[PDB]
Design a protein around this ligand. Structure first.
Ligand code: HEM
Ligand SMILES: CC(=O)N[C@@H]1[C@@H](O)[C@H](O)[C@@H](CO)O[C@H]1O
Ligand SMILES: CC(=O)N[C@@H]1[C@@H](O)[C@H](O)[C@@H](CO)O[C@H]1O
Ligand SMILES: *[C@@H]1O[C@H](CO)[C@@H](O)[C@H](O)[C@H]1NC(C)=O
Ligand SMILES: *[C@@H]1O[C@H](CO)[C@@H](O)[C@H](O)[C@H]1NC(C)=O
Ligand SMILES: *[C@@H]1O[C@H](CO)[C@@H](O)[C@H](O)[C@H]1NC(C)=O
Ligand SMILES: [Br-]
Ligand SMILES: [Ca+2]
Ligand SMILES: [Cl-]
Length: 592
């Protein structure tokens, strides 16, 4: 009585024996269990789901019910009392560039997406959710506390719809509810190529036999490509400025236009693919378009893996890196590659790294124009600021020369996200990412803070004094206890992010364990890991060792001055070097 999955919403895929290249869906990576890590399957559960009724109802759904004998605090109340702050001065990370934040979002999007329950034409219950703040079915509104300023301005709630789940879409099938991961669990550049064959096809340039991805036909960046537009309305990107009427971009991941620096990063990756495909055709004129595309794709996937494991993870996990992610020793087909449900909350540590402004810089790394520095909230689903206001180069220079926000126990999430989030269905710059994260936590039936501390072999504080000690902060611990009553009830997103950061890292002990375990698994459990014997040639592996994010920029923009270590904080001109001194990727090993 151990049915291995709800297998009804996805037919089994037949596994080719040759398999030189990944599937788009992630099927067939694991030859013994082919759907493992594939898109459109349940997130893995590392611990059993915890719901109010044991099955699907989130904690907080029913008033009179409790969690462990106490009511759970309103998501927005926790946001207001713990997560918010006013003063941006002094909040920046002195040793992480803004690219550090941005790379995190890119990696996250490659790994996991649990999209809301849109079903079909549910615009009658959707408006009913927004309009009337009415809890039922997949409508789980974020209600404002008394004295919330947004009561004066926005009504009684923020609308919120439950995440999609496996087996039934409207009703229920009698296991605990399991949310779906709509993208591949492998770190594979699915955010560039898509996780479904339909989108993967749509994204490619099949008109020419050159293995290119489709590029914008309406605009270009001083001769360089943009992503194609998504030609389907409504377009939230058109809505935010109905004069410019610039649509959202079309990328391998639907979230690509959520903010302008994400759209930028997607643009770099797209350009890199086509640059690769062109170079490969030069070396191998006999290669057809399928070949050129797959070979370029495979390279780009290795680029993302190397940047992530070699440059990013060490400076997230700090002294904990080697504990959870020891030197690679090859593919292990016993490893579970699936993204866990908890990871999709753990990796939202990035939310506390996002600063309140974004800058455009000129070739002297000085403010670009009179509106050089923009408030982050103006840039949600904003593509017109790229198309009609200077292309990506000024934004890429900002990514290099400006800093991430530093997580701070007293200054957690900038008001640009916590009060001014724009959601692609709604009309206002009035949402709260923090409140949404907490509501989502409960939506997904997450075990509480202490359950995960136990999973990670860490102490489980039961009293105010114990929590004070773990968080190394008396005031924060006191405020959490006032809202949550027991640490057992603290939502993992807020409890994990509240912990002081490990040495040389940017997350605390609990998050290091959850993140570190997940990344270990997605490396060891991936048959197409770049360094796995058999995937690349030895010569190819030696060339790949040379990649850098600096080189990506040099190759794919009109920027010619770059730092050597792009994720640290770098000041111009002292830490910048000429591109012509930065190692390029040698594609000679790819000549057949
Ligand atoms: C300006 C920057 C960003 C914005 C506007 C943004 C916005 C969002 C929004 C609206 C969601 C969906 C929330 C929900 O409905 O539950 C989300 C989810 C998420 N964000 Fe961010 N985010 C940003 C930056 C980042 C960064 C820097 C990271 C990581 C380093 C990150 C990691 C995630 C993850 C892992 C999820 C959950 C994805 C899933 O499995 O569905 N985000 N973000
Ligand atoms: C090098 C090349 O083929 N560029 C073409 C151009 O010649 C043609 O006018 C257009 C048709 O869509 O596509 C682009
Ligand atoms: C494409 C376009 O029309 N650009 C205009 C720009 O010329 C003008 O200086 C600015 C005023 O803020 O508004 C922009 O929308
Ligand atoms: C900044 O970060 C990098 C990566 O952790 C590290 O090697 C370097 O020594 C750091 N420099 C400072 C300012 O401490
Ligand atoms: C496809 O590539 C050809 C060149 O081979 C080019 O003419 C055309 O503009 C490209 N199409 C798209 C949509 O990128
Ligand atoms: C591979 O993975 C399994 C399950 O995690 C583990 O028990 C086993 O020891 C691993 N084998 C190697 C060689 O690492
Ligand atoms: Br998003
Ligand atoms: Ca992926
Ligand atoms: Cl989004």
């Amino acid at each position: 009585s151990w049915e291995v999955g709800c297998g009804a919403p996805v037919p089994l895929v037949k596994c080719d024996e040759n398999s030189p290249y990944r599937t788009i869906t992630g099927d067939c990576n694991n030859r013994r269990s082919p759907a493992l890590g594939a898109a459109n399957r349940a997130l893995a559960r590392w611990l059993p789901a915890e719901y109010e009724d044991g099955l699907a109802l989130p904690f907080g759904w029913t008033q009179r019910k409790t969690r462990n004998g106490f009511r759970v605090p309103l998501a927005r109340e926790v946001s207001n009392k713990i997560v918010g702050y006013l003063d941006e001065e002094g909040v920046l990370d002195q040793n992480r560039s803004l690219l550090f934040m941005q790379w995190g979002q890119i990696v996250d999007h490659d790994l996991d997406f649990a999209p809301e329950t849109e079903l079909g034409s549910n615009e009658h219950s959707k408006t009913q959710c927004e309009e009337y703040c009415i809890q039922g079915d997949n409508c789980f509104p974020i209600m404002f506390p008394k004295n919330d300023p947004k009561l004066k301005t926005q009504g009684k709630c923020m609308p919120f719809f439950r995440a999609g789940f496996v087996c039934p879409t409207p009703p229920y099938q009698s296991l605990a509810r399991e949310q779906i991961n709509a993208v591949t669990s492998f770190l594979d550049a699915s955010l560039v190529y898509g996780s479904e064959p339909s989108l993967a096809s749509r994204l490619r340039n099949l008109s020419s036999p050159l293995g290119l991805m489709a590029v914008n036909q309406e605009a270009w960046d001083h001769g360089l490509a943009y992503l194609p537009f998504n030609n389907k309305k409504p377009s939230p990107c058109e809505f935010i400025n109905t004069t410019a009427r610039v649509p959202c971009f079309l990328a391998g991941d639907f979230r690509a236009s959520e903010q302008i620096l994400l759209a930028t990063a997607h643009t770099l990756l797209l350009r890199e693919h086509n640059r690769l495909a062109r170079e490969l055709k030069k070396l191998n004129p006999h290669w057809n378009g399928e070949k050129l595309y797959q070979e370029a794709r495979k390279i780009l996937g290795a680029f993302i893996q190397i940047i992530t494991f070699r440059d990013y993870l060490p400076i997230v996990l700090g002294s904990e890196m080697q504990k959870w992610i020891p030197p690679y020793q090859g593919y292990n087909n016993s490893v579970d590659p699936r993204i866990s449900n908890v990871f999709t909350f753990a990796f939202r540590f990035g939310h506390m790294e996002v600063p309140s402004t974004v800058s455009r810089l000129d070739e002297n790394y000085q403010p670009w124009g009179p509106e050089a520095e923009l408030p982050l909230h103006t840039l949600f689903f904003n593509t017109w600021r790229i198309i009609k206001d200077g292309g990506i180069d000024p934004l890429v220079r900002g990514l290099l020369a400006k800093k991430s926000k530093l997580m701070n126990q007293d200054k957690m999430v900038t008001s640009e996200l916590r009060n001014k989030l724009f959601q692609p269905t709604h009309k206002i710059h009035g949402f709260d990412l923090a409140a949404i994260n907490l509501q989502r936590c409960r939506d997904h039936g997450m075990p509480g803070y202490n359950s995960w501390r136990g999973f990670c072999g860490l102490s489980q504080p039961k009293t105010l004094k114990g929590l004070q000690t773990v968080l190394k902060n008396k005031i924060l611990a006191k405020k959490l206890m006032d809202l949550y009553k027991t640490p057992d009830n603290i939502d993992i997103w807020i409890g994990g992010n509240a912990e002081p950061m490990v040495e040389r890292g940017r997350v605390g002990p609990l998050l290091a364990c959850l993140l570190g375990r997940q990344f270990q698994q997605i490396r060891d459990g991936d048959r197409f890991w770049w360094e796995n014997p058999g995937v690349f040639t030895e010569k190819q592996r030696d060339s790949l060792q040379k990649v850098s994010f600096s080189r990506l920029i040099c190759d794919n923009t009109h920027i010619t001055k770059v730092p050597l270590h792009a994720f640290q904080a770098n000041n111009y001109p002292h830490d910048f070097v000429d591109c012509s001194t930065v190692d390029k990727l040698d594609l000679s090993p790819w000549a057949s």
